[PDB]
């Protein structure tokens, strides 16, 4: 979404924006709905 998928953090995308962020700690985690799980 924002990074790059770097080594600092990193954050991936699915849906639309369920997407979601972590940081090389849990100090930065992004979680979003599990709609990756597409049915």
Known sequence: NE????EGWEIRYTREGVR???DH???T???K???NGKS
């Open 33 to 35: 709905d599990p709609r």
């Open 29 to 31: 985690t992004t979680f």
């Open 3 to 6: 990074e790059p998928l770097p």
């Open 25 to 27: 700690n849990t100090r």
């Open 20 to 22: 979601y962020f972590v």
